[PDB]
Design a protein around this ligand. Structure first.
Ligand SMILES: *[C@@H]1O[C@H](CO)[C@@H](O)[C@H](O)[C@H]1NC(C)=O
Ligand SMILES: [Cl-]
Lengths: 195, 110
């Protein structure tokens, strides 16, 4: 009966942003007041909905995307943004209907000597469409000469590690991010609030 | 669930070669190779291994395995080598996370 939002926010592991995860939420009641009444988030921004009114709303489906980025990239998780993350890793649509939530996760995701287990995509032939995901590992041809799957000058591996160090300032620290999409289609609603 | 990497340790003389195998274990879902990397003694840095020349790799989806081969071993190749994979998980194989092998400690002599 109760939507499994705990599993999303509380999960011990989070995805790399380039390999971001999505959880479908359906056929359940969701008490969103638990989120918005929580002071543990550094970012909590909604588009097209007022969070306080969620507990009295119904949607066809809810989607929860989650991943880690650095603090000064959270700005890119908004409609109409550009940057390595927005262009090449995770893109919201211009008409996004949902909420972006984030918090500093230095005390989980930083490691002494550096945590290299979080990755992002540095290059791509074209920008991602909204909610597109790209997990490929092809050598990126940055010049005119074909790479033939070999690295070298202007032939670049496309993923790069963040390398999160606890001694880094907060703009460079890891942030966990949860994007809630609220989908409304001409179909029976399956995700409603306590009212 | 995991990646089983063999051998766990290895000692070789200059000129020989090393083969490392990584078997994706406890997975009913698909997976993909991400990259291989090394950690040099006394450093926390992870140096991704670019596949070319004396570094040959292969992938065998039938055996749920991927491998790396290093030719013309030199003393400076002494390090611990890791394989990283991106594995789908969960009931419907709808989530993914990266998993590393437990590593191959290579010592090169002569
Ligand atoms: C995470 O787990 C704790 C367990 O005590 C719970 O109180 C909390 O509400 C959970 N978080 C969310 C967002 O549900
Ligand atoms: Cl091989």
């Amino acid at each position: 009966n109760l939507c499994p939002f705990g599993e999303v926010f509380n999960a011990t592991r989070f995805a790399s942003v380039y390999a971001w995860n999505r959880k479908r939420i359906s056929n359940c009641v969701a008490d969103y007041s638990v989120l918005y009444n929580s002071a543990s988030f550094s970012t909590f921004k909604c588009y097209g909905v007022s969070p306080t009114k969620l507990n009295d709303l119904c949607f066809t489906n809810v989607y929860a995307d989650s991943f880690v980025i650095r603090g000064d990239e959270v700005r890119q998780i908004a409609p109409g943004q550009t940057g390595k993350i927005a262009d090449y890793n995770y893109k919201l649509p211009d008409d996004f209907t949902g909420c972006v939530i984030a918090w500093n996760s230095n005390n989980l995701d930083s490691k002494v000597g550096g945590n290299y287990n979080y990755l992002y995509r540095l290059f791509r032939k074209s920008n991602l469409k909204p909610f597109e995901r790209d997990i490929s590992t092809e050598i990126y041809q940055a010049g005119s000469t074909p790479c033939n799957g070999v690295e070298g000058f202007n032939c670049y591996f496309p993923l790069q590690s963040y390398g999160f160090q606890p001694t880094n300032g907060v703009g460079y620290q890891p942030y966990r991010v949860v994007v809630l999409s609220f989908e409304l289609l001409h179909a029976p609603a399956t995700v409603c609030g306590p009212k | 669930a995991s990646v089983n990497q063999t051998p766990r340790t290895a000692t070789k003389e200059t000129g020989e070669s090393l083969t490392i195998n990584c078997v994706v274990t406890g997975a009913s879902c698909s997976w993909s190779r991400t990259y291989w990397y090394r950690k040099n003694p006394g450093s926390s840095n992870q140096e991704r291994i670019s596949i070319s020349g004396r570094y040959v790799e292969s992938v065998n989806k039938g055996a749920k395995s991927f491998s790396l081969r290093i030719k013309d071993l030199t003393v400076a190749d002494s390090a611990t080598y890791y394989c990283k994979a991106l594995i789908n998980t969960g009931k419907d194989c709808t989530m993914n996370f990266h998993y590393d092998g437990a590593g191959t400690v290579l010592t090169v002599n002569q």
